[model samples]
Target: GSSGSSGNRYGPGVSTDDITVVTLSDVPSAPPQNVSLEVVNSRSIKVSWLPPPSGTQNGFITGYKIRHRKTTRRGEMETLEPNNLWYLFTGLEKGSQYSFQVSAMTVNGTGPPSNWYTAETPEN
Candidate 1:
């Protein structure tokens, strides 16, 4: 006799014989690395980084998340997704200091953030 649990049984007195299993995947396991920043102009800066180490991604990288904020303020974060390993941060205040970090994202969720990198816009 085959023994089974009951939820949607074959019948009122019969045990369920069919079963299925499902598994959920996670986002990338590691953050971006070798992050670099360069001032493009008084109002813009270019940021770039390498993807997480091989096999650390754990899944496909759908995009990137760039988080930044002014060094003098708190609780105000700006985010961007250039859908690649590089981006041009624009519309920034001249000569202002800002701190930034990057993360990889997948269908599951966002991975850990990269080390913080800071740069200041050039004065006009």
Candidate 2:
């Protein structure tokens, strides 16, 4: 349902002699770190983290891609949660100032976007 290679069909039996595990997918080669997303209670949600990789695991992390920007409504927005590998950056707007970045979508097609991290809702 993304990137492709479906994994193969080990379902339908045939004399019992099958094995396919020569894998390599792509995407998610590192991004998301020094985690910390604070303050939110009246409509809460905040999760910031990413520190898992050592020469690439090769595939499978599915979920987590949030790129934010809005320093006085400047422009930029994105949210993708495949199954929650680290998904939670909700309701952003209260005193403005946010420069977020954390993209780790393993299994291919989305990586590299995690260096700018800033968030402040210091709500009134």
Candidate 3:
């Protein structure tokens, strides 16, 4: 018979048999930090950040999720692999302000989001 027990045995003098126990780990605990932004030009900018510290990354980091938008509107999200720590945002309105944030993802799920980084594109 199957039973749940804190120890190997089900009860006094009773030993459990043919039982399997599984434990699930959580995703990375910490979010990316120190996010920075640089204006590449009037229509493009670069965003970068440092990954979470070692102990907080519960599992192997698989990728990152980036969210960006202009000060006046909401924008879509994008996914990037772990190999890249930065992304080039393009096709933006000149003289406009934008904001971005990043989060780390692992096999289990995504972690918290980093602080929003903002920058203004130069006039064309």
By lDDT, the best candidate is 3
Backbone clash numbers for all candidates listed: 0, 0, 0
After superposition, candidate 2 runs with Cα above 4 Å error = 1-17, 27-31, 45-103, 106-124
Flag the better candidate by lDDT, 2 or 3. Answer: 3
Tell me the tens digit of each residue's lDDT in model 3 across 45-116.
888877788888977877888888767645556656567888887788877888888898877888899777
lDDT of 3: 0.79
**Model 1 lDDT, full chain set:** 0.77
Give lDDT: candidate 2, residue 84. 53
Per-residue lDDT over 42-88 for candidate 2, one digit per residue giving the tens place of the 0 to 100 score: 23446567645756646666666776677764568787766554555
Task: Give the alpha-carbon lDDT of every model.
Answer: 0.77, 0.64, 0.79
- Clash total of candidate 3: 0
Ranked by lDDT, the better of candidates 1 and 2 is 1
Q: How many clashes would you count in candidate 2?
A: 0
- TM-score sort, best first: 3, 1, 2
- In model 1, which residue pairs have backbone atoms overlapping below 3 Å? none
What is candidate 1's lDDT per residue for 1-124, written digit by digit as tens?
7998668646556566776677776877777877888888988888887777768777677777888777574676767565668878788887689878888877677888977888987676
Q: What is the TM-score of each candidate against the true structure?
A: 0.68, 0.28, 0.71
